[PDB]
Design a protein around this nucleic acid. Structure first.
Lengths: 105, 579
RNA sequence: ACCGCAGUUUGGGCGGGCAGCUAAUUAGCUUAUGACUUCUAAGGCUUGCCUAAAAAGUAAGGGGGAAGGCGACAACCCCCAAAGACCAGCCGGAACUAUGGCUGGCAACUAUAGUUGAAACUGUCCUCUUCCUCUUUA
DNA sequence: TAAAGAGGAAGAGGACATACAGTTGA
DNA sequence: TCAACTGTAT
């Protein structure tokens, strides 16, 4: 269900697309990233329609991460029509991410 | 265990040596912190592997049970809303609690990179990727009407702000231990902090960094390493939610104490009032009651500390009961026999018997027969403690005046700083200003007043705790902090928690009992009836029901609450009271 | 009030202690979150005199010499004195009042007899939180 | 009176208060 | 020749 993002279309897909978009910055050799991936998949299936979610491998879209102040992974950016509505870093727990989204939505 | 604080006088050269030692210990502390942060990754990885195994087991046991209940159980965590389940399903929910925090994962194909910590040791960890470039900073000009749980609040937004350098990626690579550059222990891996207890390796590191060799003794190195071990252990303990990662120490936050936790003072000459400790020439003592307080003919010095305070230089000597020594001598043998004979051997049981016996001897060494008097104590607003028999103890009113004096002196100092800064800028210099002599004197005065306030509060608390411990054998203590929901300024000067802790410890040592009854319905309840009464004033209380013996008789509210606490403690006597 | 010194605090001890009233430079009452010296940005009355943030300093047991300090003062020398005030038991529900009384002994001061000689002390590290001051906006 | 920064302090609250081998050296 | 210091173990 999660959409997979690319550098070339990021502007339109994330900035022009309507609604809030939660983008997770990703890599495969990363530990905590694999800790939190299941949670992101969960949130994808719980909040359908109320929120849209995307994943971006830094190892395949290296240009995007610098542009948005990101210096380490995992990182979560909640965007709303061209601006990041919310920002968070580090492997949150299930509850933490849940109330984070609850508050931000 | 007790601590004796003795004032000492140091010569100028001794002060210079102390300053150099403190600088060296600060450098050591920073080095140890850096090493521990670099190493935390290896612990995190094992923790993650164990967590993954646990999640897998939970998944297996959740699937293996019947499909009817497992769906609702999964949903229980898979959904914000939670219904009132039956005991059957609730048991399984508890049994698979772990899903509340995480969902199963692999952790395979990983490479063990060095992590960067956040505000905890287990959750929130991250792997760094790059340095430089612009960064997010709060912009207060942006007001976002965030619809938090408290409705709409205009929170200050964030925006990208000037960067330090061009954005550059970090070279990913696995973790690697750091090692001593040379010397007799070249190539040793610094697995733990205890590996840093070596003077040789530290000297080698300092040479690598082009700093002079260490001059401090190994005892203070050990003491500082003990402090850091304590702080780190607190950081990693889940049970404490307020202890976080240790901080780096800047030039303005240097260590202020030298700790020797290996051996007592080398010499304590009481006739000429001289103390000989490691790393210093003999130090003179300017204390007049140190020989009577220390009481060397019946105690045993263990460890000590050279401390610096606005009042002067002190030496802390820790003393214990004479038996303490053998106890430790046996305790440090336990790891040997366990390794040698195994926990089932008879030696192990004999050693535990001897430990227990010595511990009991020490404990009974300080028990005093009492008069079996029971007391209820209630912290008050006007009186620091009210007692069941009507006693109201006045607080340490003196410290409020010290606090006011601090207010005024800080106002003066800040005014002076502003005027001096304006004159500095007017002259046309952009370099940071250098502090003046009057400002230094005024700052010293403020520091001394803070110290005097703290010491006064501590002395008052010791006196009151000793009084209560001596008079009473059974003590009931409970605080109605609902008033908190300036009052905070007044209450921060009374130090109720310290008073309670001191009384608790002293009553336990004498052989009494300490209880902490619940607080439910303590201030408004007619203690002689149990009915909720009424107050006709700020401190008076009257019972409601006509059947009361004390009906229509105003009484002190604090006395009422103290007697209620006494009842809930289980003593129920309440025979008499003063006014 | 406050400040300094007596191991740290409280009551007390020696000293420093603005301004006003009354009596006779020195005694009482009111009272300041210390006192004093040098030089200056500023302000006040009318060209002079005053009040002074900041800055840099002085002393904080009593008396007598004394180099040198612009000065508060004082290196050094001589005499006097010595309070965070003694010890050991036994009572105390020990508050108000930061521990009351009795016994014994020991000191000091008075007229062999009296008065005074009070209490407590377990600190350190670390992390969160609170307080305060000064700014800026509303 | 309110709120956010910077800097200086404190209070809460939990732990803690080492022993033997081996080496130096004056 | 014994105090003092450092290394190893937990």
């Amino acid at each position: 269900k999660i959409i997979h993002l690319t550098d070339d279309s990021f502007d339109t897909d994330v900035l022009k697309a309507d609604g809030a978009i939660l983008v997770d910055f990703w890599a495969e050799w990363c530990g905590p990233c694999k800790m939190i991936a299941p949670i992101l998949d969960e949130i994808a299936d719980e909040y359908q329609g109320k929120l849209t979610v995307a994943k971006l491998n830094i190892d395949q879209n290296p240009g995007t991460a610098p542009k948005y102040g990101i210096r380490g992974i995992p990182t979560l950016l909640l965007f709303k029509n061209g601006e990041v509505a919310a920002t968070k870093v580090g492997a949150l727990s299930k509850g933490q991410l849940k109330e984070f989204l609850d508050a931000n939505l | 265990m007790k601590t004796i604080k003795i004032k000492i006088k140091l010569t100028t050269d001794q002060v210079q040596l102390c300053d150099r030692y403190l600088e060296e210990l600060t450098w050591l502390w920073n080095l140890t912190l850096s090493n521990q942060l670099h190493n935390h990754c290896v612990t995190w990885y094992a923790w993650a592997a164990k967590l993954s195994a646990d999640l897998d087991k939970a998944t297996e046991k959740l699937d293996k049970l019947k499909p009817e209940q497992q769906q609702l159980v999964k949903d229980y965590y898979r959904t914000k809303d939670k219904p009132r389940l039956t005991k059957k399903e609730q048991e399984l929910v508890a049994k698979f609690d772990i899903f509340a925090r995480w969902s199963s994962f692999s952790l395979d194909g990983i490479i063990p990179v060095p992590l960067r910590l956040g505000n905890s040791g287990y959750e929130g960890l991250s792997c760094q990727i790059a340095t430089g470039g612009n960064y997010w900073k709060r912009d207060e000009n942006i007001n976002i009407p965030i619809n938090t749980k408290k409705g709409i609040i205009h929170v200050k937004g964030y925006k990208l702000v000037k960067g330090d350098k061009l954005w550059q990626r970090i070279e990913i690579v696995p973790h690697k231990y750091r090692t001593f550059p040379g010397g007799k222990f070249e190539g040793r891996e610094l697995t733990t902090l205890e590996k840093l207890d070596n003077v040789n390796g530290l000297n080698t590191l300092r040479a690598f960094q082009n700093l002079p060799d260490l001059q401090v003794s190994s005892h203070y190195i050990g003491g500082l390493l003990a402090f850091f071990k304590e702080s780190w252990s607190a950081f990693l303990d889940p049970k404490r939610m307020n202890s976080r990662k240790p901080k780096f120490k800047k030039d303005s936050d240097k260590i202020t104490t030298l700790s020797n936790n290996q051996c007592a003072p080398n010499r304590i000459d009481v006739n000429k009032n001289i103390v000989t400790v490691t790393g210093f020439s003999p130090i003179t003592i300017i204390d007049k009651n140190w020989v009577k307080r220390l009481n060397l003919s019946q105690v045993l010095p263990r460890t000590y500390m050279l401390t610096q305070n606005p009042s002067g230089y002190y030496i802390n000597i820790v003393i214990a009961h004479p038996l303490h020594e053998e106890k430790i001598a046996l305790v440090k043998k336990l790891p040997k026999v366990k390794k040698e004979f195994g926990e089932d051997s008879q030696e192990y049981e004999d050693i535990k018997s001897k430990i227990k016996f010595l511990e009991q001897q020490i404990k009974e060494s300080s028990i005093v027969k009492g008069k079996d008097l029971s007391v209820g104590i209630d912290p008050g607003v006007q009186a620091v403690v009210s007692t069941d028999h009507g006693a109201l103890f006045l607080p340490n009113l003196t410290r409020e005046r010290v606090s006011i004096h601090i207010e005024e002196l800080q106002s003066r100092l800040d005014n002076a700083e502003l005027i001096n800064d304006k004159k500095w800028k007017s002259l046309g210099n952009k370099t940071p200003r250098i502090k003046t002599k009057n400002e230094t004197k005024l700052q010293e005065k403020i520091s001394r007043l803070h110290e005097r306030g703290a010491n006064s509060s501590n002395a008052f608390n010791h006196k009151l705790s000793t009084r209560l411990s001596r008079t009473y054998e059974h003590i009931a203590w409970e605080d109605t902090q609902i008033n908190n929901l300036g009052l905070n300024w007044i209450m921060r000067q009374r130090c109720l928690s310290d008073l309670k802790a001191k009384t608790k410890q002293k009553t336990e040592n004498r052989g009494g009992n300490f209880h902490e009854p619940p607080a439910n319905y303590s201030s408004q309840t007619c203690h002689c009836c149990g009915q909720k009464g009424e107050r006709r004033s700020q401190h008076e209380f009257v019972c409601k029901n006509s059947d009361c013996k004390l009906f229509d008789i105003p009484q002190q509210a604090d006395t009422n609450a103290a007697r209620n606490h006494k009842q809930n403690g289980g003593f129920e006597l309440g025979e008499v009271k003063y006014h």
